[PDB]
RNA sequence: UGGCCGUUUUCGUUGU
């Protein structure tokens, strides 16, 4: 999977708009680690924002 | 020889706490690894709970062998032992 | 895997040259000592069975097992099918064949007669029953374990055994 | 279940037989002879064969599978090698016993100084306690200044006066009184002399001396062949990863080998007596400090660092010896430690358990029809979600790691398989404080999953733990099997502990706020 | 799992728990022994399905026992001290 | 043969008190009515006054108690302390029986003295400690329950039952069954590593603590010092 | 190689200040030549697995003996919570 | 105490240990004859005769 | 020399098989497992006596594993050859290194140096065999040989037959 | 493409 170790944000959920890093990507439920808190939270793949060449790209990168 | 006949058994007929615990654990293990259940299960899916209930009904097929200090032993049935 | 009746048998300071098996020197080993012990510990001295007596015992046990499997209702090779396993089946078949070809005595009457006649060492008598001869000459030539006993009585024994010899 | 299949039947230990080793025994068991002090062949990997690091002894690394058993680190128990001494040497731990045995027997005829004729001794033989029997025998025979060649009728003796043996530290001197007064010419009771003297001792005297012909044959108390333990017992310490330092025991073994080799190469050249004696003493010193570095009265042996060596006696004695260090007690698994805090709102037999721990620890659970669904749920929860599982176990013993398993859904549970589910509420677990003075310092509680990272106890149970929340800590343990769960539940639950068999009275009680309030 | 913890566990009379707490949650290990000398020296190759005791020339009287690895370590450290504990699975008297 | 948790400080009233008090408490006299059971407490007060076959049973039991008091007071407890740990508390069983059957008021007892003494005597031989028919076994059984039986008799005396407790027949039956079962459960079980328990129980109190008194004295004792300070 | 991650390092092997670090994360990647390709072994300096925060100030100077000699001052703030200690 | 001295004496006297005590099996990791281990469990075939006829093991 | 022996084998049963009739199940397990094996201590195992009436006694429960073991004590009939046995032999095949004398379950090895000089092999004749003065060794004919070698390899014992002593050969 | 390796020994300071 070429979709690991990238900066990622949350577009929907109780943490709307928090910068997070993909720590573990087993499957269909991405484990992403945030910066503001000292914790990592699971989250579905479709509730995130992925950085791309330009702007923030949803789960199509 | 090392056995002693059931007519002359001398040990206490009550079931000691240690015997209770050992039988319960043994049965619950056996129960939990595909052993048959000698009484009904209704809601107590816990094998330990099944063992507790089965003992309460005196339906457990295990014989205690107590060792005398000398080396002789006697055979008590979990059926016959008076459970308090 | 398998076990026997003797216990302990630890390493001792004193070894024994009387441990290599030898039938002529009466060296059977430690597990076949003169006084063995049974499951219950009773007086149980060693049992040595003649070829014909062993054949009869195996045959009766096998027919009893066949009856028990059938549960309410003999041939040598047919008797070999009762046991389970290709190796087990073959070995039972071949031991039945060996008993058939070298069991000096066949029928119940004659085996009972020889048992009553023959029946001091257990093994020597068992092997004398197992070992056949023609005269005392061949008996002494082939059996180096009875050369000097001061009681032979072997000529009449051989005459009786050849008398029971089934004609062939 | 952990171990692979093995054909040998499994039973338990009933008897442990102590007794020394007959040198022929050592030879019969050793699989190699050690001759080369150089452990590493040419610093080109593959340590020198026949050296202290021989690959026949036992595998020490993951890659190499032991040559002898033919297995790897997982299974191979190591293997032994023997080592011959050109000169037989003493055993430092038998100096007093060897001295006494010599006192009890003759010098040249090498038999007991007294026969059954003296009723005192025949009585002494009636002692069944070998130690006390030998004690009494020594008590009588320590005054027999002269060995009788004739009955007190020749007894086969020597007739020469028995010397007075006095302990010169590491050596033994016998001061004879040769046949009013003669010049007393004492000499060193050399090891070979004693060995030959003991070699002919009768089984009669042996048993009468408390020894045993089958196992404890006195001459073996003199060191002739020295077995060498595989590296398993003397692993090396990688100071900084690639940098590897040698175990001090290996150094001592190598130095003994060097001293032995040197002692070999004295008789083939000029050996002006004095040199042989000094070299012999040096070899004995090595072999001694190799087996006890705390010999009283004499200086200890060191490394190039100057620190005293680690002889096996140290390895076994002291608080950190094998017994008190790793046999009576040991560091165990499935545990956890934390601070404690009050909780008026919890039951008596319950305890706050931070979520992280219940996520970390886990308990195997066999697969039955009664929990198939619940176990599948715990499986799909993933190991990072409470409740959750951590591994899946097959009938063959394989462990599936849910961390590196992306096919979680495609796992189908099977009866008899095990699932290390997370800890759940109401489960039984031990609990403890240090010091554990009285048995009311350990109990079996029930689990309640909660946030935050502290344990919490009902404010009443503090007294049995003699604990307070001014910073105290507790430890935990978890059963890994059902029988153990049964035992904990039926034997160590808090309720059964309420009254103390120490003083036949209740041990807990209403304390502090509850008490001062209910007043 | 210090001394006092062992003693408290004994006092509560819980045997099997103490067993496993000192066996499976710690250095669980397996060995083989010769029934004649009683020692662990039996050279065995499991996958190869062979067994023998060099000193005893012993190929059939072999067992396997499960013991703490620290215990086997202690036995080997001992028999390097000229002291040979022989392990027998049957009592004598 | 008792666990250490199944005991409680009780009082055996047979020990203390005066001869006069003992007599006025336990003694009975069927011939004399001015010092006999109150008739308003029994349905058969007529059948008793002046009778003898009952007087002999009462005399036997009273002599048993007299012997017990002499034995205890002269052998067991020399100073006169009558407070000690004994198994199976009684006062509680008595009052539980009282509550279970509403035994207040002056309702006359319907329980025959012979039944009471028969049960009491039978009970004293039913407290199993060792089970077997060897003589020595029976002697040991007798020796074990000596003080417990003394307590039982000190409590369940006919005067005491009929006046202070006013039990009925079924109440008495329940009391006897309760004492039996409670004692039978109060045994030390097999396998108790009693040694460890005693060790801990003795060690722990030391933690919290002109002759020499304190830990030094305990150390002296434990090591058996030849020359004490 | 370790089981952790390396991506937070620079192109030259040091992590830049201001980057958040987590447990089991490599912060200094050091390599050792292997005594004889594929002749190098990981010699990293992973962050203590029980710590979290943000790298703050990276230092890079020579030691007394003229080799590279680094120092990473990671920081975080401790919120009082259940299980702290206090005293008058 | 005196672990080394005791061990050397045991070797010297050819002593035999029965594993009778508790601490023995503790070192050997076996069920010491205490508490729950102070007896054995005999599986009875007689009482299992009471089971229904259709519960014959395969 | 056939022998009756008192044989006992420990058997293991899973707790899943705990019902009315473990006795019979253990019995056929024993019949299937013990029979047909050859061992140095005892030898080839062929038959067991009263297979239907073996007293398995009261079984054990292994602590911590839940398995149950039964000490199946019984009496069987086994055979093993000992050194110095003179018994009749059966020949089934001929090889240059020594005729294959399958005497009972095992095969008896015939040393080339231990064969009578007058006894020779003739490939031309059918069946291939040896003929001599008052002697012939062919498939199915009674032959006397002495066994002086018994090499057991714990799995299938090796027996060495000899015909180089007095009165050894075809009667 | 699974599989997967991080020192010891000292001394110190503290903690309950
Ligand atoms: Mg405090
Ligand atoms: Zn190996
Ligand atoms: Zn002499
Ligand atoms: Zn051996």
Nearest to D208 by CA among D305, D286, D122, D275: D122
Q: Which long-range contacts (CB under 8 A, 24 or more apart) does G47-54 make?
A: G47/G21, G47/G22, G47/G23, G47/G74, G48/G23, G49/G23, G49/G24, G50/G23, G51/G21, G51/G23, G51/G76, G52/A38, G52/G20, G52/G21, G52/G22, G52/G23, G52/G76, G53/A38, G53/G20, G53/G21, G54/G18, G54/G19, G54/G20, G54/G21
d(CA C103, CA C50): 8
Burial of G64 (0-12, 13-18, 19+ CB in 10 A): exposed
Buried b (16+ CB within 10 A) or exposed e, I141-168: eebbbbbbebebeeeebebbbbbbeeeb
Ligand 2 midpoint to CA E43 (Å): 8
What is the phi/psi pair of residue D126, to 5°? -70, -10
d(CA G9, CA D515): 59
Judge whether residue G3 contacts strand J, using its CB and a 7 Å cut-off. yes
Ligand nearest to the CA of D158: 3
* C-alpha distances in Å from residue C153, one per residue of C140, C146, I70: 12, 11, 49
Query: What SS3 state is found at E29?
Result: strand
d(CA E38, CA C10): 8
Question: Computed over its alpha carbons, how large is the radius of gyration of chain B?
Answer: 14
Distance E31 CA to J7 C1' (A): 29
Nearest to D78 by CA among D69, D87, D86: D69
Residues 6+ apart with CB under 8 A from G61: G69
d(CA H30, CA I139): 60
Nearest to D163 by CA among D126, D127, D189, D132: D189
Positive or negative, the Cα torsion across H27, H29, H35, H39?
Answer: negative
Distance D272 CA to J11 C1' (A): 48
Ligand nearest to the CA of E41: 4
Take residue F17 and report the two structure tokens written for it: 């008190």
Buried b (16+ CB within 10 A) or exposed e, G14-48: bbeeebbbbeebbbbbeeeeeeeeeeeeeebebbe
d(CA D354, CA C159): 96
d(CA G29, CA G57): 17
Take residue E35 and report the two structure tokens written for it: 């029934």
d(CA A23, CA A30): 8
d(CA C93, CA C81): 8
To 5 degrees, how large is the angle CA D137–CA D138–CA D141? Answer: 85
Take residue D156 and report the two structure tokens written for it: 């086969």
Ligand 3 midpoint to CA D114 (Å): 11
CB atoms within 10 A of CB E29: 20
> Residue E18, by phi and psi: left (phi above 0), alpha (psi -120 to 50) or beta?
alpha
Residues of B in contact with E13 (CB under 8 A): 18
SS3 of chain G: CCCCECCCECCCCEECCCCEECCCEECECCEEECCCCCCEEECCCECCCCCCEEEEEEEEEECCCCCEEEEEEEECCCCCCCCCCCCC
Work out whether strand B62-67 and strand H40-43 pair parallel, antiparallel, or are unpaired: antiparallel
Architecture of C49-168 per CATH? Up-down Bundle (1.20)
Please indicate if any CB of chain H lies within 8 Å of the CB of E59: no
Residues of D in contact with I63 (CB under 8 A): 483
* Cβ–Cβ < 8 Å for B62, B76: no
Number of helices and strands in chain E (H, E): 3, 5
Nearest to F14 by CA among F149, F138, F191: F149
How far does Cα H23 stand from its chain's mean position? 12
Distance D401 CA to J5 C1' (A): 19
* Cβ–Cβ < 8 Å for C110, C166: yes
Burial of D389 (0-12, 13-18, 19+ CB in 10 A): buried
Residue D434: nearest nucleotide (C-alpha to C1')? J16
16-75 of B, contacting H, C-beta below 8 A: 18-19, 21-23, 26, 36, 38, 61-67, 73, 75
Take residue H54 and report the two structure tokens written for it: 């259709």
Compare all CA atoms of chain G with the CA of A21 and give the residue at the minimum distance: G20
- The gap between the terminal CA atoms of chain B, to the nearest Å, is 31
* C-alpha distances in Å from residue D353, one per residue of D455, F205, H19: 5, 32, 40
**What is the signed CA dihedral for D114, D117, D123, D127, rounded to 10 degrees?**
50
13-72 of C, contacting D, C-beta below 8 A: 13
Compare all CA atoms of chain I with the CA of D11 and give the residue at the minimum distance: I62
Buried b (16+ CB within 10 A) or exposed e, B27-57: bbbbbbbbbbebeeeeeeebbbebbbbbbee
To 5 degrees, how large is the angle CA H47–CA H53–CA H56? Answer: 80
d(CA B16, CA B83): 8
Cross-chain Cβ contact B35/I19 below 8 Å: no
Residues 6+ apart with CB under 8 A from D37: D51, D52, D254, D257, D258, D261
* Cβ–Cβ < 8 Å for F146, F14: no
d(CA C71, CA C65): 9
d(CA D480, CA D484): 7
Place of tokens 């394989």: D398
* C-alpha distances in Å from residue E63, one per residue of D302, E36, E51, I14, I131: 42, 11, 10, 21, 53
Q: How many domains does chain B have?
A: 1
Please indicate if any CB of chain D lies within 8 Å of the CB of F3: yes
Positive or negative, the Cα torsion across F75, F78, F81, F85?
Answer: negative
Domain with B2, as residue range(s), is 1-84
* Cβ–Cβ < 8 Å for I14, D415: no
Take residue D412 and report the two structure tokens written for it: 């189908």
CATH of the domain at B24: 3.90.940.10
How far does Cα B17 stand from its chain's mean position? 11
Query: Which residues in 29-68 of chain D line strand J, with CB less than 7 A from it?
Result: 62
Q: Which domains does chain I have, with CATH numbers?
A: 1-82 (3.30.1490.120), 83-171 (2.40.50.140)
Bridge partners (DSSP) of residue G57 are G73
**Which of D11, D19, D71 lies closest to E63 in CB terms?**
D11
Positive or negative, the Cα torsion across I33, I37, I41, I47?
Answer: positive
Judge whether residue D5 contacts strand J, using its CB and a 7 Å cut-off. no
Bridge partners (DSSP) of residue D225 are D84
- Per DSSP, helices labelled H in H1-58 are 3-12, 22-28
Q: Which domains does chain E have, with CATH numbers?
A: 1-81 (3.90.1800.10)
Please indicate if any CB of chain C lies within 8 Å of the CB of D24: no
Cross-chain Cβ contact B29/I16 below 8 Å: no
What is the phi/psi pair of residue D328, to 5°? -65, -35
Bridge partners (DSSP) of residue D399 are D393
Distance D69 CA to J3 C1' (A): 23
Cross-chain Cβ contact C23/I82 below 8 Å: yes
How far does Cα H55 stand from its chain's mean position? 32
Cα of G18 to nearest chain D Cα, Å: 28
Peptide bond connecting I127 to the previous residue in cis, omega within 30 degrees of 0: yes
What is the phi/psi pair of residue D13, to 5°? -80, 130
DSSP calls for D113-142: SS-TTSHHHHHHHT---HHHHHHHHHHHHT
Take residue D63 and report the two structure tokens written for it: 């890659």
Q: Using an 8 Å CB-CB cutoff, list residues of chain D that contact chain G.
A: 241-242, 338-339, 341, 452-454, 471
Judge whether residue D470 contacts strand J, using its CB and a 7 Å cut-off. yes
d(CA D109, CA F35): 98
* C-alpha distances in Å from residue D243, one per residue of D240, D307, G32, H21: 5, 20, 12, 46
Ligand nearest to the CA of D197: 3
What is the phi/psi pair of residue G83, to 5°? 105, 5
Cα of B69 to nearest chain H Cα, Å: 11
* DSSP type of residue H37: G
Take residue F214 and report the two structure tokens written for it: 């304190």
d(CA C161, CA C166): 10
Buried b (16+ CB within 10 A) or exposed e, F98-109: beeeebeeeebb
Nearest to E26 by CA among D323, D487, D318, D334: D334
CATH of the domain at H22: 1.10.150.390
**Which of I19, I61, I66 lies closest to B33 in CB terms?**
I66
Cα of D461 to nearest chain I Cα, Å: 32
Query: What SS3 state is found at I5?
Result: strand
**Which of D242, D454, D471 lies closest to G82 in CB terms?**
D454
Residues of D in contact with E49 (CB under 8 A): 7
CB atoms within 10 A of CB B72: 12
Residues 6+ apart with CB under 8 A from A5: A21, A22, G5, G7
* Cβ–Cβ < 8 Å for I92, C30: no
Distance D309 CA to J8 C1' (A): 14
Work out whether strand D187-188 and strand D223-225 pair parallel, antiparallel, or are unpaired: unpaired
d(CA G86, CA D161): 82
Query: What SS3 state is found at C129?
Result: helix
d(CA G63, CA B24): 67
Please indicate if any CB of chain B lies within 8 Å of the CB of F132: yes
Place of tokens 């002495």: I146
Nearest to D223 by CA among D175, D288, D303: D288
SS3 of D207-269: HHCCCCCCCCCHHHHCEEECCECCHHHCCCEEEECCEEECCHHHHHHHHHHHHHHHHHCCCCC
Please indicate if any CB of chain D lies within 8 Å of the CB of F51: no
Nearest to D496 by CA among F84, F6, B83: F6
* DSSP type of residue I41: S
Domain ranges in chain C are: 1-48, 49-168
Work out whether strand D455-457 and strand E86-88 pair parallel, antiparallel, or are unpaired: unpaired
Residues 6+ apart with CB under 8 A from C124: C145, C146
Neighbouring C-alpha atoms within 13 Å toward the C-beta of F60: 11
Take residue C142 and report the two structure tokens written for it: 């082939």
Cα of E41 to nearest chain C Cα, Å: 15
* C-alpha distances in Å from residue D90, one per residue of D190, D225, E75, I163: 9, 11, 22, 59
DSSP calls for chain F: -B-SSSEEEEE-TTSSS-HHHHHHHH---SS-STTS--GGGBTTHHHHTT-SHHHHHHHHHHHHHHHHHHHIIIII-SS---EEEEES-SHHHHHHHHHHHT--TTPPB---HHHHHHHHHHHHTT--SS----HHHHHHHHHHTHHHHHHHHHHS-HHIIIIII---HHHHHHHHHHHHHHHHHTBPPTT--HHHHHHHHHHHHHHT-----SHHHHHHHHHT-SS--
Chains G and H touch (3+ CB pairs under 8 A): no
The binding site of D for Mg(2+) comprises 468, 470, 472
Bridge partners (DSSP) of residue D338 are D474
Positive or negative, the Cα torsion across D18, D24, D30, D34?
Answer: positive
Cα of E56 to nearest chain H Cα, Å: 20
Bridge partners (DSSP) of residue I86 are I146
d(CA I110, CA I107): 10
Distance B33 CA to J10 C1' (A): 52
Please indicate if any CB of chain D lies within 8 Å of the CB of E57: no
Largest CA distance in chain A: 28
* Cβ–Cβ < 8 Å for F61, F54: no
Q: Tell me which method was used to determine the 3D structure.
A: cryo-EM
d(CA D415, CA C114): 61
Residues 6+ apart with CB under 8 A from H29: E19, E22, E23, E66, E67, E68, E71
Nearest to F155 by CA among F111, F76, F95, F79: F95
Cross-chain Cβ contact G22/A23 below 8 Å: yes
Take residue D55 and report the two structure tokens written for it: 């690959």
Nearest to C7 by CA among C27, C28, C31: C31
Judge whether residue G1 contacts strand J, using its CB and a 7 Å cut-off. yes
1-58 of H, contacting D, C-beta below 8 A: 3-4, 7-19, 23-28, 30, 35-36
Residues 6+ apart with CB under 8 A from I105: C91, C94, C95, C98, I38, I44, I46, I79
Compare all CA atoms of chain D with the CA of B26 and give the residue at the minimum distance: D483
* Cβ–Cβ < 8 Å for A21, A6: yes
Judge whether residue D307 contacts strand J, using its CB and a 7 Å cut-off. yes
* Cβ–Cβ < 8 Å for F28, F58: yes
**Which of D241, D242, D341 lies closest to G82 in CB terms?**
D341
Burial of B58 (0-12, 13-18, 19+ CB in 10 A): middle
Neighbouring C-alpha atoms within 13 Å toward the C-beta of D348: 14
| Chain J, protein-covered positions (CB within 7 A) | 2-9, 15-16
Cross-chain Cβ contact H14/D491 below 8 Å: no
Domain with H13, as residue range(s), is 1-37
């Amino acid at each position: 999977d070429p979709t690991l170790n990238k900066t990622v944000k949350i577009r929907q959920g109780g943490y709307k708009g928090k910068i997070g890093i993909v720590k573990e990507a087993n499957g269909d439920r991405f484990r992403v680690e945030l910066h503001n808190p000292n914790k990592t939270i699971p989250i579905p793949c479709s509730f995130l924002l992925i950085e791309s060449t330009h702007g923030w790209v949803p789960y199509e990168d | 020889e090392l056995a002693i006949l059931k007519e002359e058994r001398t040990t206490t007929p009550y079931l000691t706490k240690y015997e209770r615990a050992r039988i319960l654990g043994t049965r619950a293990l056996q129960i939990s690894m595909n052993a048959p259940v000698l009484v009904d299960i209704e809601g107590e899916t816990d094998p330990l709970q099944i063992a507790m209930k089965e003992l309460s009904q005196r339906k457990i097929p295990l014989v205690i062998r107590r060792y005398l200090p000398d080396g002789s032993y006697e055979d008590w049935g979990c059926d016959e032992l008076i459970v308090d | 895997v398998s076990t026997s009746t003797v216990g302990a048998r630890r390493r001792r300071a004193k070894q024994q040259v009387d441990d290599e098996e030898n039938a002529t020197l009466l060296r059977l080993g430690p597990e076949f000592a003169l006084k063995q012990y049974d499951h219950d510990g009773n007086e149980h001295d060693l049992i040595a069975l003649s070829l014909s007596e062993s054949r009869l015992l195996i045959r009766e046990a096998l027919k009893a097992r066949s009856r028990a499997r059938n549960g309410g209702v003999i041939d040598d090779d047919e008797l070999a099918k009762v046991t389970s396993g290709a190796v087990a089946n073959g070995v039972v078949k071949k031991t039945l064949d060996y008993l058939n070809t070298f069991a000096r005595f066949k029928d119940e009457e004659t085996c009972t007669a020889v048992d009553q006649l023959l029946h001091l060492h257990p093994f020597e008598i068992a092997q004398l029953s197992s070992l056949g001869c023609e005269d005392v000459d061949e008996a002494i030539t082939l059996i180096p374990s009875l050369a000097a006993k001061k009681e032979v009585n072997l000529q009449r024994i051989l005459d009786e055994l050849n008398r029971l010899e089934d004609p062939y | 279940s952990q171990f692979p299949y093995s054909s040998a039947p499994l039973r338990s230990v009933k008897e442990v037989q102590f007794g020394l080793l007959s040198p022929e025994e050592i030879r019969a068991i050793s699989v190699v002879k050690i001759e080369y002090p150089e452990i590493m062949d040419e610093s080109r990997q593959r340590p020198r064969e026949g050296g202290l690091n021989d690959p026949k002894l036992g595998s020490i690394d993951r890659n190499f599978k032991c040559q002898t058993c033919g297995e790897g680190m997982a299974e191979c128990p190591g293997h032994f090698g023997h080592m011959e001494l050109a000169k037989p040497v003493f055993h430092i731990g038998f100096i007093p016993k060897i001295k006494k045995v010599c006192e009890c027997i003759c010098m040249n005829c090498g038999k007991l100084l007294l026969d059954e004729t003296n009723p005192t001794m025949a009585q002494a033989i009636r002692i069944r306690d070998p130690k006390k029997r030998f004690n009494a025998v020594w008590q009588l025979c320590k005054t027999k200044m002269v060995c009788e060649a004739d009955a007190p009728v020749s007894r086969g003796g020597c007739g020469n006066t028995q010397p007075v043996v006095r302990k010169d530290g590491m050596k033994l001197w016998g001061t004879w009184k040769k046949s009013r007064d003669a010049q007393p010419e004492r000499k060193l009771l050399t090891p070979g002399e004693i060995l030959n003297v003991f070699k002919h001792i009768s089984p009669e005297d042996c048993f009468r001396l408390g020894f045993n012909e089958d196992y404890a044959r006195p001459e073996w108390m003199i060191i002739t062949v020295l077995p060498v333990p595989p590296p398993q017992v003397r692993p090396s310490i990688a100071m900084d990863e690639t940098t590897q330092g040698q175990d001090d025991l290996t150094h001592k073994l190598s130095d003994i080998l060097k001293a032995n080799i040197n002692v070999q190469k004295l008789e083939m050249d000029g050996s002006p007596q004095h040199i042989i004696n000094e070299v012999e003493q040096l070899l004995q010193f090595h072999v001694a400090t190799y087996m006890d570095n705390d010999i009283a009265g004499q200086p200890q042996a060191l490394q190039k660092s100057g620190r005293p060596v680690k002889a096996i006696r140290a390895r076994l004695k002291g608080k950190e010896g094998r017994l008190r260090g790793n046999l009576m007690g040991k560091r165990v698994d499935f545990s956890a430690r934390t601070v404690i805090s009050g909780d008026p709102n919890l039951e008596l037999d319950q305890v706050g358990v931070p979520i992280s721990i219940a996520k970390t620890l886990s308990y195997p659970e066999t697969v039955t029809q009664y929990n198939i669904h619940r176990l599948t749920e715990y499986v799909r929860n993933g190991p990072n979600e409470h409740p959750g599982a951590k591994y899946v176990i097959r009938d063959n013993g394989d462990r599936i790691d849910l961390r590196y398993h992306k096919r979680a859904g495609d796992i189908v549970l099977q009866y008899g398989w095990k699932v290390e589910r997370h800890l759940m509420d109401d489960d039984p677990v031990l609990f403890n404080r240090q010091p554990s003075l009285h048995k009311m310092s350990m109990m079996a509680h029930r689990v309640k999953v909660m946030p935050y990272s502290t344990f919490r106890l009902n404010l009443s149970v503090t007294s049995p733990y003699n604990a307070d929340f001014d910073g105290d800590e507790m430890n935990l343990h978890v059963p890994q099997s059902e029988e153990t769960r049964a035992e904990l539940s039926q034997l160590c639950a808090v309720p059964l502990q309420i009254v103390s068999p120490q003083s036949n009275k209740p041990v807990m009680g209403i304390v502090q706020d509850t008490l001062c309030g209910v007043r | 799992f210090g001394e006092m913890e062992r003693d408290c566990m004994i006092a509560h009379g819980a045997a099997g728990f103490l067993k496993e707490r000192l066996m499976e949650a710690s250095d669980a290990f397996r060995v083989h022994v010769c029934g004649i000398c009683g020692l662990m020296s039996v050279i065995a190759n499991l996958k190869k399905n062979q067994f023998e005791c060099r000193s005893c020339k012993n190929k059939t009287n072999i067992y396997q026992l499960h013991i703490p690895y620290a215990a086997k370590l202690l036995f080997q450290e001992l028999m390097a001290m000229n002291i040979a504990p022989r392990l027998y699975t049957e009592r004598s008297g | 043969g008792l666990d250490g948790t199944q005991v409680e400080r009780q009082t055996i009233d047979t020990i203390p008190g005066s001869d006069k008090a003992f007599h006025k408490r336990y003694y009975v006299d069927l011939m004399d009515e001015k010092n006999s059971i109150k008739p308003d407490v029994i349905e058969y007060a007529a059948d008793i006054l002046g009778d003898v076959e009952l007087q002999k049973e009462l005399n036997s039991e009273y002599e048993q108690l007299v012997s017990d008091r002499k034995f205890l007071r002269e052998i067991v407890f020399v100073n006169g302390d009558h407070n000690w740990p004994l198994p199976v508390n009684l006062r509680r069983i008595i009052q539980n029986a009282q509550q279970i059957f509403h035994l207040d008021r002056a309702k006359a007892s319907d329980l025959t003295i012979p039944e009471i003494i028969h049960g009491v005597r039978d009970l004293c031989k039913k407290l199993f400690v060792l089970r077997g028919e060897n003589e020595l076994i029976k002697e040991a059984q007798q020796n074990a329950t000596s003080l417990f039986q003394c307590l039982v008799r000190a409590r369940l005396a006919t005067r005491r039952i009929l006046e202070e407790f006013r039990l009925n027949r079924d109440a008495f039956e329940w009391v006897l069954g309760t004492i039996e079962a409670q004692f039978q459960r109060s045994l030390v079980h097999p396998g108790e590593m009693v040694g460890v328990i005693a060790a801990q129980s003795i060690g722990e109190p030391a933690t919290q603590m002109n002759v020499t008194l304190g830990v030094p004295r305990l150390k002296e004792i434990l090591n058996v010092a030849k020359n004490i300070k | 190689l370790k089981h952790g991650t390396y991506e937070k390092l620079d192109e030259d092997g040091l992590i830049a200040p201001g980057v958040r670090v987590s447990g089991d994360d490599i912060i200094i990647g050091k390599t050792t030549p292997i005594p004889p390709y594929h002749t190098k072994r990981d010699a990293s300096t992973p962050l203590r697995s029980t710590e979290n925060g943000i790298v703050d100030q990276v230092l890079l100077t020579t030691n007394q003996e003229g080799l590279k000699f680094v120092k990473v001052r990671m920081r975080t703030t401790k919120v009082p919570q259940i299980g702290d200690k206090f005293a008058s | 105490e005196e672990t080394v001295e005791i061990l050397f004496e045991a070797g010297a006297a050819a002593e035999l240990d029965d594993c009778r005590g508790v601490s023995e099996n503790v070192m050997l990791g076996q069920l010491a004859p205490m508490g729950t281990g102070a007896f054995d469990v005999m599986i009875d075939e007689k009482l299992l005769t009471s089971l229904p006829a259709d519960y014959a093991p395969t | 020399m056939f022998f009756l022996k008192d044989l006992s084998l420990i058997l293991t049963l899973h707790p899943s098989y705990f019902g009315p009739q473990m006795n019979q199940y253990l019995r056929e397990k024993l019949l299937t497992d013990v029979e047909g094996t050859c061992t140095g201590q005892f030898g080839y195992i062929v038959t067991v006596l009263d297979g239907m009436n073996i007293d398995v006694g009261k079984g054990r429960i292994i602590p911590g594993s839940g398995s149950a073991e039964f000490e199946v004590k019984y009496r069987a009939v086994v055979w093993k050859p000992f050194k110095g046995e003179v018994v009749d032999a059966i020949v089934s095949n001929v090889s240059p290194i020594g005729f294959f004398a399958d005497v009972g379950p095992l095969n008896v090895f015939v040393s080339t140096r231990l064969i009578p000089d007058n006894l020779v092999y003739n490939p031309s004749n059918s069946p291939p065999a040896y003929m001599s003065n008052d002697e012939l060794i062919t498939k199915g004919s009674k032959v006397r040989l002495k066994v002086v070698g018994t090499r057991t390899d714990v799995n299938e014992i090796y027996a060495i037959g000899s015909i180089k002593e007095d009165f050894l050969g075809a009667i």
